[PDB]
Amino acid sequence: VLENRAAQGNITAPGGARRLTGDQTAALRNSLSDKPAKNIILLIGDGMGDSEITAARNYAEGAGGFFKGIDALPLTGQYTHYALNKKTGKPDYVTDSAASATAWSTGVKTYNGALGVDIHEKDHPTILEMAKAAGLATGNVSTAELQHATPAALVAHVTSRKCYGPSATSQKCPGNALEKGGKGSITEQLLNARADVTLGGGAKTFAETATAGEWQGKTLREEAEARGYQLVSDAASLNSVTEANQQKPLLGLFADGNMPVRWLGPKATYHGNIDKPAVTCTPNPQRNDSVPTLAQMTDKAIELLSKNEKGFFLQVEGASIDKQNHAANPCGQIGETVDLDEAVQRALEFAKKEGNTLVIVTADHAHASQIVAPDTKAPGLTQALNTKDGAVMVMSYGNSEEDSQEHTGSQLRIAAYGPHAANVVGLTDQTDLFYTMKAALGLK
Amino acid sequence: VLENRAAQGNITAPGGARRLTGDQTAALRNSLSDKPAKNIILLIGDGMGDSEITAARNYAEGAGGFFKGIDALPLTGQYTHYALNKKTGKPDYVTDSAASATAWSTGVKTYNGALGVDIHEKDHPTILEMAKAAGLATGNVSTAELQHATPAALVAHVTSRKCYGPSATSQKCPGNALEKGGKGSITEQLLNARADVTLGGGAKTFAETATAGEWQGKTLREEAEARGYQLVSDAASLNSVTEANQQKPLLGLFADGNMPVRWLGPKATYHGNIDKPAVTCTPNPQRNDSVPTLAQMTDKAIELLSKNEKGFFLQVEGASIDKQNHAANPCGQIGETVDLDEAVQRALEFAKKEGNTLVIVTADHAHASQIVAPDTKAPGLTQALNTKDGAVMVMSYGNSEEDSQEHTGSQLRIAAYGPHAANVVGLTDQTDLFYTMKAALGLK
Ligand SMILES: [Mg+2]
Ligand SMILES: [Mg+2]
Ligand SMILES: [Zn+2]
Ligand SMILES: [Zn+2]
Ligand SMILES: [Zn+2]
Ligand SMILES: [Zn+2]
C-alpha cells in the first residue's frame, strides 16, 4: 500500500524499474476498513481508461514515473460499464456518458442518452439526492457545462441528455417539460436539487426563461438568484466565498460552455507520426487565469463541504479528457488528465488527514486512444509526442472515419482509498459503485 | 474476495446488474497472506489486455457473465510493461513478447526481441533456472512453438528471439551460436535447461541437427531422446505419463508450428460490421481430437509437478490470443481466451485445494482489439458478432494498415490468488512480478 510507485532507480538495471518497495500484504491488510465513511469524494475522469492513464503518465511523468494523485490509491479493480438497448433490454456494449453516469448515481442500468431514468423512463433517486436527504452536504464539480451528462446525472431525471434547458426539453423531453407537468429541464432540475456546492461551466443555458411555474418569465439565472443561490464567475469570487449551505447554496458558472483545456497541441492526423514532427504540448493561451482549475474548485468545495457535521458527498469530473479524445487531440487529452490528477491529490490529502473519507477515482467508460510503436503505419489519426523520458511516444485514434473518435467497451480501472475501499477490488460493475457509496455512508 | 462475480439478476432492474453480493472487506482481509508459497502457477494470456478479456466475456458469457477462472482472482491491480530502446536505454513504450517475457522472468527491462539478456546483451538467470537450482520442480507449457518468445524467455538467453535452432542462430545470434562458443540456439538451450515438464508445439525446429558438440549431426529431437527426455506427441501418450523429473524429463511436441486454434471465424474486414452480417464462431474442424487443450496440458503438468515435495513453478501460456489479435480474427482470439480460462480454472481448483499455491493471471502487453458501437464506420478492420446475450458486439482493429495488427502500450490487469497475492494490487511494473515470485518461493 505504498504511496510511491515510481521506478526504484536505473530502469536498465536489475530491479531498477520496480515500483514496489517491499511487501504490500501488511500494508494492505492495514488499509482494509469496513467502518463507515463520513465523507465520499468520487473523482471521475471522463473517458479515462487504462490507456489514457498510461499515455498521460508516459508523457507528463515518464514511463517509470507515477501520478501522485491518480496512481496513489492502494485498492484497485476493474469494472464493467455496458449500457442497455432501450427496446430489447439487451446489453449495448459501448455506453455513452449519460447511461454510465446514471449507473453509479442510481445503481440501475439504462440506455444511452438517459439521465436518471431506467429503460422504462421511470425515475430513480441519485446518490446526491439520498445524501442531501440524510443531512449530508453535497457537491458537484466539473469542467464541462453543468448540463452535461456526468454532473447532470446527479440532479436530473430526463429521457434525453439533450434537454439542457426549457426549449430543448419542450421538444425532446416533452414529458419532462415543465409546462407539461414534468419536473423540468436539466438546468431546472439542477436548481431544484439544490446541492450546497455546484461548480462548472454551462452558463449559457441559464439565460433561458422558464415557461411555467413560479419563475416563469424570469431567466434561469434570475431564478437561481431569487432562490438564494450565490453565483460566482471566476477564481477570485470563488475564493471569496466563505459558506455554502441550504441557505446559501453556491453556484459557479465559469464559462458559457465547457471550461477551456489546459494544454494546446495539434490534432492527430493520418500518417502524422510519419509525416509530422513529434510534438511538445504547451499551455492553452485561450484559457484565462481568472478561470479556476479543477483542483481549485475541488479544494474550495472540500473546504465549504467539510464544515457539515453529518459529512459530505462530492463528485468531481475531469470532463475534457473525453472531449479531447473524441477530437483526436493528444495534448488537450493529456493536459486534462494531469489537471485531474491535481484534483485527486487535493482529495487524497484531505482524505489522509481527515481519516474517515472514502476517495474513488475511475472513469465512466473507455475511449479511442492507443499507445502504438513509433513506426506504426496506422489507418487512423496519429501523432508523435516528446515525452518527459526524452523519448517519442505515438498515440493512435483509429476507430472512426468520422471527425469524432468513439468510446470503447473495455473494462477499466477503478481505484479507491479509505473506509469501504475493498469493495472496489476484483471485477465489479459500475452499478456496484452506487451500492458501495450508499453503504459506506450508511445512506440506506 | 468472492468467487461469483456475475450480475445478480435482471440487469434492467435496480441492483440486478451488481456483481457483489455483499461487502469484500472481511473476505479480502482473510485472503491476505504473506506466508511462503510452496508452488507458483503463472498463466499468461499473450496480448490479453482488459479489452481482450471484456470482448471474450461479452461473447462467451454475456456482458453480465463472468469467467469462472479468469475473473475469479480476488486480488487485482494494473501493471506496466514498457521495453527499452537498445541504443538510448530510454523507454520504448510498446513492448514485444520477448522483452516483456524477459522482464517478468528475469527482473530486468530489455530491448524488443531480446530473450534473457539486458540491453548490454548480458544474461540474467530466469525464475525457472532459480527454482530448478532450489530443488523445485519446473514446468513450461504453451500453445505456441516452444521456441517462441514467451516459453523461451524462461530457458534461453539469446540476443534475438528469431534464433530458434542451429541455422538461424548462426546468422542472427552468432555470439550464442554453439560453434562460436555460444550456449546455443533457443531449442538447444531449452534442451539444456531441462525443466521437468515442457509442453507445446514447435516440433519443426527439433528436426534440425546440431552443428557442433556431443550431438552434432543428430537432430534436436534425437538429442532430446539421447539426453533421457520422454517424448510425447499427442493426448494419448501425454496422459500415459506417470512421472517426470530430472531423470525422466517430459518433452511434449504437439504441433510442427503453433498448436491449432479452437474456434473458427472469418477475418475482420474494412467496414465488416456494416457490409457483412454478424458472425457466430464455430469449433475448428481441422483441429485433430488428439491434440491436447491448454487445460489438459495444464492439468497433466500440475499432476506430475505436484509430486515434488519442495514445490513447483509452472508457467502456462495461452499464446494464440495474441496471434489472432495480430490476424484480426475475433473468433480465433476469443476462442483462445476461452481456452486459457479453462486452464485457469484447473490452476485455481488446484490452488484452492493445496492452499500454499500462488496463482497469477496476466498478459505480457496490450493489443489492437477494441469493442466499438454496432454502427461504427471505422477506418480499419471490423466485424459484428452474435454474443451469448443474443446481442451484436462489434470488434475493431485500427492500428495498422499492414497485414498484422500491433501491440499497444496501455497498462493492464494482473490478478492473483494465494500467499503473496497482495503484491499484485495497485500499480506495479512487469519486473516486480519477478520479485513477487522469487520472494513468494523464498528463492533468494
Ligand atoms: Mg462528462
Ligand atoms: Mg507468446
Ligand atoms: Zn463519458
Ligand atoms: Zn464521449
Ligand atoms: Zn506477447
Ligand atoms: Zn504479438
Q: Which residues of B touch A118 (CB under 8 A)?
A: 12-14
Q: How far is CA A350 from the centre of its chain?
A: 19
CA distance A427 to A412: 10
DSSP run (H or E) holding B31: helix B24-31
Cell 499432476, residue?
B303
Please give the resolution of this entry in Å, rounded to 1 decimal.
2.5
> What is the least distance, in Å, from the CA of B385 to any CA of chain A?
12
Whole-number Å distance, alpha carbon B409 to ligand 4 midpoint, is 22
CA distance B286 to A442: 57
A385–B contact, CB cutoff 8 A: no
Structure-block grid coordinates of residue A352:
489522509
B25 to A420: CB separation less than 8 angstroms, yes or no: yes
- By CA distance, what is A376's nearest residue in B? B400
- Contact (CB, 8 A) for B95 and B136: no
Cell 430489447, residue?
A88
CA distance A117 to A158: 7
For residue A96, give the amino acid letter: D
Shortest CB distance from B53 goes to which of A24, A84, A411? A411
A8–B contact, CB cutoff 8 A: no
CA distance B68 to B62: 13
Taking the alpha carbons at both ends of chain B, their separation in whole angstroms is: 29
CA distance A331 to A337: 10
Specify which residues A394 forms β-bridges with: A372, A384
Residue of B96, B106, B202 lying closest to B146 (CA atoms): B202
A134–B contact, CB cutoff 8 A: no
Question: Which structural domains are found in chain B, ordered by start?
Answer: 1-444 (3.40.720.10)
B97 is catalytic: yes
- Contact (CB, 8 A) for A8 and A66: no
Give the three-state DSSP class for B223: helix
Residue of A361, A358, A363 lying closest to A440 (CA atoms): A358
- Contact (CB, 8 A) for B305 and B137: yes
For residue A180, give the amino acid letter: K
For residue A254, give the amino acid letter: F
Structure-block grid coordinates of residue A56:
498521460
CA distance A5 to A81: 27
Q: How far is CA B292 from the centre of its chain?
A: 16
Whole-number Å distance, alpha carbon A324 to ligand 4 midpoint, is 9
DSSP run (H or E) holding B120: none
Shortest CB distance from A425 goes to which of B54, B76, B108? B76
Q: Which method was it determined by? A: X-ray
The sign one gets for the Cα dihedral A350, A306, A155, A424 is positive
Residue of B281, B297, B278 lying closest to B233 (CA atoms): B297
B409 to A55: CB separation less than 8 angstroms, yes or no: yes
Write the DSSP symbol of residue A374: T
For residue B291, give the amino acid letter: V
Q: Which position among B31, B33, B51, B97 bears the catalytic label? A: B97
A17 to B53: CB separation less than 8 angstroms, yes or no: no
Output Rg (C-alpha) for chain A, integer angstroms: 21
B275–A contact, CB cutoff 8 A: no
CA distance B58 to B338: 11
B366–A contact, CB cutoff 8 A: yes
Q: How many CB atoms lie within 10 A of CB A336?
A: 30
> What is the least distance, in Å, from the CA of A113 to any CA of chain B?
14
Residue A189 half-sphere exposure toward CB, CA atoms < 13 A: 32
Structure-block grid coordinates of residue A381:
489519426
Strands B263-264 and B83-84 turn out to be unpaired
Residues within 5 Å of ion ligand 6, judged at the Cβ atom: B 322
For residue A20, give the amino acid letter: L
Shortest CB distance from A372 goes to which of B15, B94, B387? B94
Task: List active site positions of A.
Answer: 97
DSSP assignment of A125-140 equals --HHHHHHHTT-EEEE
The 3-class SS string of B357-398 reads EEEEEECCCECCCEEECCCCCCCCEEEEEECCCCCEEEEEEC
Q: Where are the alpha helices (DSSP H) in A276-426?
A: 294-305, 320-326, 330-354
- Contact (CB, 8 A) for B406 and B369: no
Residues within 5 Å of ion ligand 4, judged at the Cβ atom: A 322
Instruction: Give Cβ neighbours of residue A436 (< 8 Å, ≥ 6 apart).
Output: A420, A423, A424, B20
- By CA distance, what is A120's nearest residue in B? B12
DSSP run (H or E) holding B330: helix B330-354
A391 to B12: CB separation less than 8 angstroms, yes or no: no
Q: How many CB atoms lie within 10 A of CB B188?
A: 28
> What is the least distance, in Å, from the CA of B110 to any CA of chain A?
7
Cell 459557479, residue?
A252
